[PDB]
């Protein structure tokens, strides 16, 4: 596919259709200008690491169908996608830095030992998976003939986080292979051995449009801390520090759950900075509190349904000084630092 | 006019005054940096197709006075503007890709057969028009001595859509020439022969700040569909599909009127993508519905006062399968696809 | 410090820690791409006048601690900062165009006669100040042994305007030297001789989030002009024009106080354009009023607590035609144009 | 034609054949990289004023057939070429800044009043010429039915200056139209009226490979000035100054004929600088003489067969102080400054 | 001076005249395009570290008059030039990275403690020098009232190395100040104390056009090594290794004098690579010998008149193992490594 042909589809199909046709173009810097109706117009601006003309082609051939949020594929260490390409609207670029059977200019020659992502919706996908060494196979339907584990009921659809697709709930089932064997998932136990049940998933919310998803979260959003801490006997769980956050010093104390930041945002403006942005289970922001002048260079925030978080803490028999607890979130074991006082998610 | 002199006016006059003076500059990539008070500052960022230094000059000499929204000049196929230059704040660049008597670097040598835009507010404008082969002449006042047609009562003022200028209503009158003859406008009939009255104009609204402009639109915004469809006996007009839109499938059904998208936006987040952006009567978005996961790659939306739209449909004696109806909007004949079921504006 | 090491700190410390470590990078245009977890990500986009790799280093070593808003350092004509670097989040770049003891690539060799900024929080700062010819020394604590003047109780903290730092009020004391002498500040008089008390400071508010800070301002925001003008016998002060602004003509009349623009914004959309953006006591916008179509290319706005403004006008014995009054704001003498009718802040 | 298709022809045909096929590409800055045999290679570097992708297309579609040297088309003021494009290997870019029926991105819409170049070798060329207002028509054969004037017997063939094409002498005949009339060439008279016979043509030689073309030139190259000046009684013609050049002062005296510079180059290294480079009858160099340290910022050199030059001077009845003589060279009237002492070609 | 005005002078004066006039321009990347005669032409290509528009201005205002070769000003550690700017045609950029009273965009504010270069040919130059702390003052004439030292009889004239200027020998006299005192030069002694007479100067020759300058050098160029080594009883001076160079191993042995490289070039092709190029007394090349396959990554070459070199070695009472000798060349003390075997110029 040529540049003019790519630029043609982007403009007439909304992505790569494979339809015939050309449109006059000009690549100026990161700008891709299309001459349309004799008037020049910028149709794509390049913020990927690829050459502009190439970059517009990847973007033009991005998945326009729903798929598991990329943080999950990050946690699974996907090296490349088989016959398709994912776009990180958070990253404002392509997901994997490599392509396969997608773009002549970037497609790798060998992906043998790489950890490959196969979408059951692509023809040949499943046959490819069954023969690969390392990879993840996904399907919107549970295959009885594949050992599989179900993911959260939400997905990335053109960068939007949806929980339904045509009012039908989002469903995804994962199958995995490593060193040429099929990882056998079973109903119980922990996904990863010591170094949990692999059932916890981040909520995927934006501070700009946060929303409570349980009667408890709602109670967090509308009840004074003391009141709320009482209703759920969170008494001895340092929630004040860890989830509400303290703004009396120069360094913000705690503030590790997203919902906490949302609650703050209600009375005080919270300016978040993030130099490394893309879908990830745990974020690392540079927070500054407008009303107190308090702040923190590196403050990790994770968006867990408050309910889930409260249990994680209850399951903790916090009677040990500096204990390093492992919490499996989004199919991965993340470790949390736990002094009988603060409980924070480490910069793993 | 030199770069330093342009950069001087931009900074002291707010556009090109023609006043004398220089300011030290540096053109770095698309950036134009002015050394002001010994401190370097970016005063212009280039997203046009021209060389940065040139681009800042065009922008500096942009029309700071009101004028007809560019989609209208698009519909009239204006090739270039006579002695002035228009800026598309939607496009974030210059309107026509060519200039005339404006910028030494870009001004064309011959615009004889081109379709020229003459503003009666420019000296020599009218004399130039009367001698051109193809062009449009505009004036805020109706000239008794020119055959003219009145445009909508709104205008582009620095990219803002206004309906008054000093609390005085916006008024524009168009005169047109083709193959050296004056197009003679008359009170009745259709602007274009079969292939209507040329009195329909898009509303120019932003989904971000939509606003009802008739008691009917308001009723659309606040009454349940069923209720509303009843009050106006829209019974047999498929409004459900076409104007409210259906989100039960994977592909959004209908959703072709802007006000419809606004109404949705009330309960569900609608993420619109548009690769080709500039003022145009009909837009083509890549819509995705956040609450249902429904979406459509190419979904054309036009912003017609709902009232006008309801008549367009009533005038339709929809008793014919696949009929292709022509609707003259913004001085141009756009064709709409009409099955006894869906009525959509084609990607003309 | 190397690029990889800078890019490492930015990502792990949130700024320059001086910690060891490298991260693979790629400088593409103004983009700085970090290869993280085998996935390429843009961590910095260059809009400064420096070479991209250099620019990320300055930004990485920006002051993450509170400091006086830059307009104040602008008014004091600071040429360079001693051993530290300030970032203008408004400018989206570095403050001074020069560096000193901060970046090998940009640090000047001699800053002898330059006007230097010394922060008492930097080791060696005060000793350096006491020996410089021209410079300003600042400290969060009032030094009994230095002649000093107190600044406003607010500060730039990572670009956010705070009035507390750990719920403790912001405090800054300035010491100044010129031609090798210490400027001796005294309790009374005017900071600058004729060409006032040097106690007036702009409020630092954003039209996007304006907020009344006195019962008077609140009354301006909620009482009809006539009503309000009465409650404070502003009768003969042309407030209508100057502070409320007139929108009946093509050229906006008056409109020189920020709070005035905020009040407007309540019923009419005010689109502000500003080609030269950075923290400055007086701004120069290109305003356009959406509801009236009125506008002005160059319209200077200053954000003074309305209370302070009302006195400035009262102190004026406006009984003289074209009198040019000097008003000392933010440690600097700005001149205002005053006809018995309009009172505007000049484009000094 | 797409980028990949252009890049394909350049690589397989050596220019634009119109053959089908694509090659993977990447446009990085002014570089055009082709992925060939899985190895990336730069096939074109952009030093034109167009966007890189566009620039390679023009170059790919350059005239690979012989044609009159561009200085001649410069002297005739050609604005654009009809259905073909010329490449200035001196300029290292395209000739005219505009194209017509050659490149969708750059082809002008109207060339009506422009001065057009029609090549009789292009189909439709002659019919187009006969209908244009202003233009030049060329043909390798003398058309009995067109008023025509013959040009020099040499041509630009891929940037090389040839005098034969398949051992057959180069031949070109020019036909011209202005204000819709055919310029009628006759055997005698002067091409341009006072403000000569239009038979003088520059020799097209490179100082790097200069070569005598008459027994006289050879005698200039091998006989001492005095000797040579005698053999041709050039006694009273200031040849010393004007053609041999004087190097005793700080400013080179004379030195206006190319052959003169070549002769010098024999014993002293002459470093020529030229900021505006392309085929032009008269050059303007910044000469510096290595052996004497003499030099001149602006020193105009023209390459006339010494024989022709000697007559031009003889025809001059130099008995007048400051007389400004017109000399028609390469179909154009260039004026020469003539004091009874120095005779130099002006920077017309 | 504006861009258009700079571009105008470059084109009509050959450098900056200060004459009035503009030329349309376009800055594309490092390219500066001038629209001349309606045809776009590149007049300057930017390989300096400055922004293109700025870079063309410096180049346009370069010294077109003779001056001491830059390596000498390098050896004197000149930080900036007073009221003028030097161009390194070797470097293909500006000499000092800073300017003073030359370019608004780059001129430093304070050069007080910097080491300044004052040219006696600039008005005010000498008065400026007499008041500076650290600097060098130069004059083509020996001032009886200034302590001065004479430099070599050759100069950089537009990048060409000349020994005459209008057949008059090149002459330069240096005056120097440090810590506010005038360095007092006397007839005898060593310029620098231990850590010689300051009368040795490199020859400034190009391997491409090397030329013997003494009957001895000529004898080196035409006599077999053995023969030559005999005629000058160079017997015990390892000249074989050090000056002729050995090519029998993989690492070239010796080869530190330029004339040696020239002699080689006679029978074997010597490919020199140099990553850091500009006028410097000692070069560091990456040499590879075509006929023997021998080579050396870092091989320092200095161009001394062979005669001078032979004495330097004779003055050496080489009877000491690893002695580090200091040799003052081009006004600077460079140290040479000297084992009773090899004598090489260190990478100081």
Swiss-Prot record, chains A, B, C, D, E:
Residues in domain AV-Nsp11N/CoV-Nsp15M? 63-183
Instruction: List, for all copies, the residue spans of the domain called Nsp15 N-terminal oligomerization.
Output: 2-62
The UniProt record lists the NendoU domain at: 211-348
- The catalytic residues are 241, 256, 296
Lineage: superkingdom: Viruses
Location in or out of the cell: Host cytoplasm, Host perinuclear region
Q: What reaction does this enzyme carry out catalytically?
A: uridylyl-uridylyl-ribonucleotide-RNA = a 3'-end uridylyl-2',3'-cyclophospho-uridine-RNA + a 5'-end dephospho-ribonucleoside-RNA
Instruction: Name the cofactor(s) required for activity, per the record.
Output: Mn(2+)
Cofactor: bound how, per the entry note?
Likely affects Nsp15 binding to RNA.
Annotated coiled-coil segments of the chain: none
Q: What does this protein do?
A: Plays a role in viral transcription/replication and prevents the simultaneous activation of host cell dsRNA sensors, such as MDA5/IFIH1, OAS, and PKR. Acts by degrading the 5'-polyuridines generated during replication of the poly(A) region of viral genomic and subgenomic RNAs. Catalyzes a two-step reaction in which a 2'3'-cyclic phosphate (2'3'-cP) is first generated by 2'-O transesterification, which is then hydrolyzed to a 3'-phosphate (3'-P). If not degraded, poly(U) RNA would hybridize with poly(A) RNA tails and activate host dsRNA sensors.
Q: What is this protein called?
A: Uridylate-specific endoribonuclease nsp15
Which taxonomic lineage does the organism of this UniProt entry have?
A: Viruses, Riboviria, Orthornavirae, Pisuviricota, Pisoniviricetes
What is the name of the gene encoding this protein? Answer: rep
Q: Shown portion of the whole protein? A: 6504 to 6872 of 7176
